Nucleic acid binder design. Sequence first.
RNA 1: CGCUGAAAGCAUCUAAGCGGGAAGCCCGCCCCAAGAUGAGGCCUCCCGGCAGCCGGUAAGGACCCGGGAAGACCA
RNA 2: CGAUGUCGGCUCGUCGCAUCCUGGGGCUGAAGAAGGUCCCAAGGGUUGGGCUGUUCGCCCAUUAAAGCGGCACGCGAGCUG
Lengths: 37, 140, 204, 58, 173
Amino acid sequence: MKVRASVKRICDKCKVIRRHGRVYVICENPKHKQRQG
Amino acid sequence: MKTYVPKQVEPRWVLIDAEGKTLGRLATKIATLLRGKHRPDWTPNVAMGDFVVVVNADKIRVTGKKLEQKIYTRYSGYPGGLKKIPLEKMLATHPERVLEHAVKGMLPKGPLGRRLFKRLKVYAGPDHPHQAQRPEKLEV
Amino acid sequence: MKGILGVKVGMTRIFRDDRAVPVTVILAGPCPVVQRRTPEKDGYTAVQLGFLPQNPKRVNRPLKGHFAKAGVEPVRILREIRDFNPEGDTVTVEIFKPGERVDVTGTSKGRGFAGVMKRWNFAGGPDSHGAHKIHRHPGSIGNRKTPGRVYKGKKMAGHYGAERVTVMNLEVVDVIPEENLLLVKGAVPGPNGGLVIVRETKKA
Amino acid sequence: LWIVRINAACRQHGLNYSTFIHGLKKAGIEVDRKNLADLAVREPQVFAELVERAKAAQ
Amino acid sequence: RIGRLPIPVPKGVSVEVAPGRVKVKGPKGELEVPVSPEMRVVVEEGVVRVERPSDERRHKSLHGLTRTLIANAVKGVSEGYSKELLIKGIGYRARLVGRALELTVGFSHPVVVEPPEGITFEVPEPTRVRVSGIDKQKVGQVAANIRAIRKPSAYHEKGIYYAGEPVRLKPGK
RNA sequence: CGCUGAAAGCAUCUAAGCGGGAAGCCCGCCCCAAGAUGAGGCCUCCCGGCAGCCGGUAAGGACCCGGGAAGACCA
RNA sequence: CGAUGUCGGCUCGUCGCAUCCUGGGGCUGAAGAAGGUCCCAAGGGUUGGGCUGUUCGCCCAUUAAAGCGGCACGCGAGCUG
Ligand SMILES: [Zn+2]
């Protein structure tokens, strides 16, 4: 879970979802899994 | 022609169903009745507001996420004595203390205020030991 | 939750399986029941025990009526076991048995106005190198101007001991029914003859 | 105090303080907060008539 | 294209709208859908539907979710729901014991699962397991707990799998 | 970290929901505690001359000893 | 500036978390073990000694770890000097 402020798509499978109010970059790739903060 | 001063009269009990009503608003009206600023013979320096009994206080409702974002906090005087309380937890523990608190915040401080709050009577659930006092129902 | 009143008669070690296990000896029984806290009548469940008996000329009228309401002999001390409904009319050591874990409560030996070291194990100050008249003082007690006060519960002098104390999870080394004696491993709070109360342990 | 008592007595007749004031002002009456208050406490019928001309102002 | 979609209601299915809740009794069993009071139920024989009173985000949302949830319900009491799990890893297996399920995937002791209300623990093999019942979400919650017990491995196919759950494990040593 | 899942035909842990989830928080353990002036509750005991007044008084208490692992004193 | 006593040590703590260990978890160039990184987490702990006035630091032996800081670089109507 890459936590950061510039959550962004990396691969096309990088899919953004505003979960619990936060912005999570959920993807099939575990590495692209990002949490904005 | 001095301004009129009223005679000390028998305050009239009043029942209020807290069920469904909004916390802050209903507590406000409770404060208005409790101050007795509904009576044309009102006077500031005298506790002549009406005794109040509220039922189903546990049934109170609150807008938004205040169930968990509102934190009744308290203080012991001891280091780290800041005891935070979510609103829901305060409901399950002591529903009546919620309304009693949110109305205590709305009354004038000082001794007259305290006697006013002592004129207050919150009761979770429907009942109350005041039938002899004749708590008149009054929709708000 | 079973529990009986008792008195601390002294400590002693015994030899149980080639082990000098120290114990305390507690004359517990026989505790007669005098009143039962029922929730409909007293808001909760518990009982009230008499130990030891009292000279009838040493009992005020109110207590006497309190005994006549039961069928109990006038008794010196009277207490309550919370959440305990003894079936019989007199709780004894029979409720307990060896190996059973208990928790015992009694008043510690009152150490009067205890100093700060004995009361809280503060280090005090040094005994040489120039320490001027503060060999057993607690040193500082707070901070400078912020907060410029002293917190609640700052460990200071006062009465160490002489208070209710509950040491817990002890072992019932042995029961002596004919004597109403009880042998509990470890030490018990209070002086010899000090009143104490034994109960089932809340541990597991 | 006068605005308080007057506001109470007026609310016992449906309207609030500001509405009553606006009425009497529009109603061409000049009686002040003191005498209004004393009427509302002493003359519920007379003060009632004042509210009558007050809503009458609307 | 989803709340727009009608919810066909084939018997044997009892559908009955009370305020904020439906009631559907099928052959598998019975249940109720908590329903959006803003949302409307087109209780029609052969098909019951849902109608959003507006077109806000909240009413296409509650409309679609209401429809999907209801149809899942009638599918529940009507024909229930089931889920299979492929226990893998050498020696890892399971077998029913009474109602609860025995399952051993390499701990200091095997692990048993209690089936809540109904939640069927069918043990076709020790390798694979089924869990069924009226409820769609509750099934996936139970089996969810199951795969939560001994999840798949990163470096081996040694662990609980969902029926259809693929296995994309990275290489190792 | 999830089940169900629409908005958004798919998917989505969330937006309706339900769950799991930490030496964390609440309770739970001990201690204090009704000045908790909201002064709580149970048991027992007590019963006139001039909202009171006074009276000796009831119950009871106190003072006074003789002490006490109680204690500076007091308690 | 008709006085707010200044480094250090001691005693006593209390608090923040920007967490050193302990708890939970994500990702991994995570085979396991051990790790790295980040996330949540302040309940508790955070050793002893040599040198030096020292704080600091180095070293010694450990430890789960040997946290960083605020509190007038806390604390002299508490001590030392
Ligand atoms: Zn990606």
